[PDB]
């Protein structure tokens, strides 16, 4: 029917651009404690590249009128929304705010006003309002799903447009009009039901072993996928993110038979079967939906037949977190990925050291139950992944030239992100700041416990060598 | 539309405490119009 | 030159009153910032020189 | 000629009696800057001059 | 901006009836003069305002290009502001109006110069400066101006009352 669109639902901004003679759709994404500059990623053309639907989601908090917002700003110290009201946009990764910076770029001068992210919510160029885009409807009416929208800041009455200069798909803020499509993803949270786009901790047995990858700086690459016991049960290495490929409401219930893309939250890779070495981890280059897709089913029967349950709504209730077991099988290959354990070797005497290999026979022991992952743990894991990627890029750029002490022009190849890495270390310093001694003892103990947990989850991933 | 207009017109005066003669007479006119419309609706839905 | 002089005169006459009202509101400050960003510096002085 | 006459007319419809009406000032600023193809977009500096 | 608008004209932009081609500079002079009045830029040292004061005095005294009272009034207010803001930062820029007033007496356009020269000791009172350059021509100049006004100038009582000068510079 008509989407309710509550003021507490996940919203992903998107727009359509034609620069390659194609009417594809591009969304807006921004990283966390890094370069505060919005960047675009291919989300409509997901068949060849994997779209990252993790740093592009935003959350609505408040919806007030212009005069009410002005009154609130003048004196600082699930309802619906109307058409032509102030709308907040809070980042769902680490609780940022969509703001406009007073900078200039793109070699355009005049009026650039580059957009970015803000740490606080003091106001000014932080809120955004809606305006009539299509003549079908006017102000004062219910906001409909899709059908394009216009986002304008309150303090700076500027639109959101693209870049027509040499810069490839740069979001700027000027006075030209550019339609922006609306594509909601998630809805109000349930009482413990499986939701797409949420990280999960896969478990094996009851409380003995889990599924993860070996630690870094090993004898080879991290494409082994072993079966470690309780050592990494509470560690960030055993974390998986699932996202369907569809552009539709990914926040609905993760019903059986839906295409699943298992994405590593630490290496930024995907798990699939290449039919060449077994259960290996594939990068973002070879992104084929034939082998990278997975599905859920009940028991160990096929019962696939004709496709079913292609509805747009939330969907029927399903398995809760830790209620019962689940079975994972390939969508095309149709094999079970349960462990084998042929013979316990005396070389790798790591208590539970079993390789994960898929076979048709199985072992009647696909005991996997879903477990909820904490928001802090997922945010920390995303921070480690992005930070390690930045340092890998930095060391690669430094090692690109090692034996050319000639000068004669500092430009010699790829550039380096000096400002971005400086801001990243400054943000990391501001994040790992131990609290001072002026609050209650229980709050201090909780803060130290959280800091110790962050440091331990940091050290398990390492990034010290 | 009239409800939205009167809510906004309150939001203009939501901070002040004393209403001038012009504001008071605007309140009176808008509220009289609303009362007339409400009487009209009562007579529309009058009877079973 | 007459068109440019007329446009600059119109922009100058469009300034938000004086400093008496720009110290309390933000709309005047935003208008002043937009006007200052529209035309760069070292231009009027160079034209006069 | 048309641009000069339009600028001359707009000059006389802002200052009133030496003051500056903020409402008309911001309205004319928003209308003038809403369309980039204004006040000579190919030579004022909008197009890259 | 002050120096820029200063060095463009020369001797009141050559205020002479040689051709009288363009006379539209009066509005620009009035606007920049009002700008100078509305601001207080002369605070520090190293101010090349000598040519500015020279051409201002030339325009005030030698008024030949047309007749316009508002220009004279705004120029005399500008001169008063200049002599009330600057405090002994320029020797010749102070000795030139004094020499011009003392050489040109019993005139109609010399009223701003004489009243500025009379009001200067009211603000200075020979304080925070000790220079003998002005004292060489100030008492003798005052004496000859007084005797000229008393003998060779049949001035009315109103003119004497409205243009009375004290010149209490004696030490």
Swiss-Prot record, chain D:
Provenance organism: Oryctolagus cuniculus
Residue runs in coiled coils: none
Function text: Cytosolic calcium-activated calcium channel that mediates the release of Ca(2+) from the sarcoplasmic reticulum into the cytosol and thereby plays a key role in triggering muscle contraction following depolarization of T-tubules. Repeated very high-level exercise increases the open probability of the channel and leads to Ca(2+) leaking into the cytoplasm. Can also mediate the release of Ca(2+) from intracellular stores in neurons, and may thereby promote prolonged Ca(2+) signaling in the brain. Required for normal embryonic development of muscle fibers and skeletal muscle.
Assembly information from the UniProt record: Homotetramer. Can also form heterotetramers with RYR2. Identified in a complex composed of RYR1, PDE4D, PKA, FKBP1A and protein phosphatase 1 (PP1). Repeated very high-level exercise decreases interaction with PDE4D and protein phosphatase 1 (PP1). Interacts with CALM; CALM with bound calcium inhibits the RYR1 channel activity. Interacts with S100A1. Interacts with FKBP1A; this stabilizes the closed conformation of the channel. Interacts with CACNA1S; interaction with CACNA1S is important for activation of the RYR1 channel. Interacts with CACNB1.
Chain positions with Phosphoserine modification: 20
Something else known: Binding of [3H]ryanodine indicates that the heterozygous channel is activated by Ca(2+) concentrations 4-fold lower than normal. Single-cell analysis of cotransfected cells shows a significantly increased resting cytoplasmic Ca(2+) level and a significantly reduced luminal Ca(2+) level.
Superkingdom to which the source organism belongs: Eukaryota
Modification after translation, per record: The N-terminus is blocked. Channel activity is modulated by phosphorylation.
Subcellular locations according to the entry: Sarcoplasmic reticulum membrane
Entry's family note: Belongs to the ryanodine receptor (TC 1.A.3.1) family. RYR1 subfamily.
Swiss-Prot/TrEMBL domain comment: The calcium release channel activity resides in the C-terminal region while the remaining part of the protein constitutes the 'foot' structure spanning the junctional gap between the sarcoplasmic reticulum (SR) and the T-tubule. Pore opening is mediated via the cytoplasmic calcium-binding domains that mediate a small rotation of the channel-forming transmembrane regions that then leads to channel opening.
Tissue: Detected in skeletal muscle (at protein level). Fast- or slow-twitch skeletal muscle.
Name the record gives this protein: Ryanodine receptor 1
């Amino acid at each position: 029917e008509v989407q309710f669109l509550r003021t507490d639902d996940e919203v992903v901004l998107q727009c359509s651009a034609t620069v390659l003679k194609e009417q594809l759709k591009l969304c807006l994404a921004a990283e966390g404690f890094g370069n505060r500059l919005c960047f675009l990623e291919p989300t409509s053309n997901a068949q060849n590249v994997p779209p990252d639907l993790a740093i592009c989601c935003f959350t609505l908090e408040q919806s007030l009128s212009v005069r009410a917002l002005q009154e609130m700003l003048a004196n600082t110290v699930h309802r619906t929304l109307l058409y032509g009201h102030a709308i907040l946009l809070r980042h769902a990764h680490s609780r940022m705010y969509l703001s406009c910076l007073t900078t200039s770029r793109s070699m355009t001068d005049k009026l650039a006003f580059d957009v970015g992210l803000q740490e606080d919510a003091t106001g000014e160029a932080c809120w955004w309002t809606m305006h009539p885009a299509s003549k079908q409807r006017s102000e004062g009416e219910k906001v409909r799903v899709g059908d394009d929208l216009i986002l304008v800041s309150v303090s700076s009455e500027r639109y959101l447009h693209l870049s027509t200069a040499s810069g490839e798909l740069q979001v700027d803020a000027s006075f030209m009009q550019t339609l922006w499509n609306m594509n909601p993803i998630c809805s109000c949270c349930e009482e413990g039901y499986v939701t797409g786009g949420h990280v999960l901790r896969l478990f094996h047995g009851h409380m003995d072993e889990c599924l993860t990858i070996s630690a870094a700086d090993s004898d080879d690459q991290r494409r082994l996928v072993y079966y470690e016991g309780g050592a990494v049960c509470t560690h960030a290495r055993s974390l998986w993110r699932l996202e369907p490929l569809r552009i539709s409401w990914s926040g609905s219930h993760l019903r059986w038979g839906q295409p699943l893309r298992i994405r590593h939250v630490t290496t930024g890779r995907y798990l699939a079967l290449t039919e060449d070495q077994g259960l290996v981890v594939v990068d973002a280059c070879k992104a084929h939906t034939k082998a990278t897709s997975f599905c859920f089913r009940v028991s160990k029967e096929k019962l696939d037949t004709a496709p079913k349950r292609d509805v747009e709504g939330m969907g029927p209730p399903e398995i809760k977190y830790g209620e019962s077991l689940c079975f994972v099988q390939h969508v095309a290959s149709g094999l079970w990925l349960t462990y084998a354990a042929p013979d316990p070797k005396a070389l790798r005497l790591g208590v539970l050291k079993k390789k994960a290999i898929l076979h048709q026979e199985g072992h009647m022991d696909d005991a996997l139950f879903l477990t909820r992952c904490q928001q802090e743990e997922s945010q920390a894991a995303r921070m480690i992944h992005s930070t390690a990627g930045l340092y890998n890029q930095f060391i690669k750029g430094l090692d690109s030239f090692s034996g050319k002490p000639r000068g004669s022009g500092p430009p010699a190849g790829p550039a380096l992100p000096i400002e971005a890495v400086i801001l990243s270390l400054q943000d990391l310093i501001g994040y790992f700041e131990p609290p001072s001694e002026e609050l209650q003892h229980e709050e201090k103990q909780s803060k130290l416990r959280s800091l110790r947990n962050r440091q331990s989850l940091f050290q398990e991933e390492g990034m010290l060598s | 539309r009239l409800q939205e207009s009167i809510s906004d017109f309150y939001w203009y005066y939501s901070g002040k405490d004393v209403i001038e003669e012009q504001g008071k007479r605007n309140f009176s006119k808008a509220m009289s119009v609303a009362k007339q419309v409400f009487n009209s609706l009562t007579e529309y839905i009058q009877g079973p | 030159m007459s068109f440019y002089a007329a446009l600059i005169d119109l922009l100058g006459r469009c300034a938000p009153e004086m400093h008496l009202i720009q110290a309390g509101k933000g709309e005047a400050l935003r208008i002043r910032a937009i006007l200052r960003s529209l035309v760069p510096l070292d231009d009027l002085v160079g034209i006069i020189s | 000629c048309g641009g000069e006459r339009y600028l001359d007319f707009l000059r006389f419809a802002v200052f009133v009696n030496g003051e500056s009406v903020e409402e008309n000032a911001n309205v004319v600023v928003r209308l003038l800057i809403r369309k980039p193809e204004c006040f000579g977009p190919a030579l004022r500096g909008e197009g890259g001059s | 901006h002050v120096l820029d608008v200063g060095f463009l004209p020369d001797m009141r932009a050559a205020a002479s009836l040689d051709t009288a081609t363009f006379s539209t500079t009066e509005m620009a002079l009035a606007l920049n003069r009002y700008l100078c009045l509305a601001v207080l830029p002369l605070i520090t040292k190293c101010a090349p305002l000598f040519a500015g004061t020279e051409h201002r005095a030339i325009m005030v005294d030698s008024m030949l290009h047309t007749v316009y009272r508002l220009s004279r009034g705004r120029s005399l207010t500008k001169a008063q502001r200049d002599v009330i803001e600057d405090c002994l930062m320029a020797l010749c820029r102070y000795i030139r109006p004094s020499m011009l007033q003392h050489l040109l007496r019993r005139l109609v356009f010399d009223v701003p110069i004489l009243n500025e020269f009379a009001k200067m000791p009211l603000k200075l009172l020979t304080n925070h400066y000790e220079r003998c350059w002005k004292y060489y021509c100030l008492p003798t100049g005052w004496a000859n101006f007084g005797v000229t006004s008393e003998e060779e100038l049949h001035l009315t009582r109103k003119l004497f009352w409205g243009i009375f000068d004290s010149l209490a510079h004696k030490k």
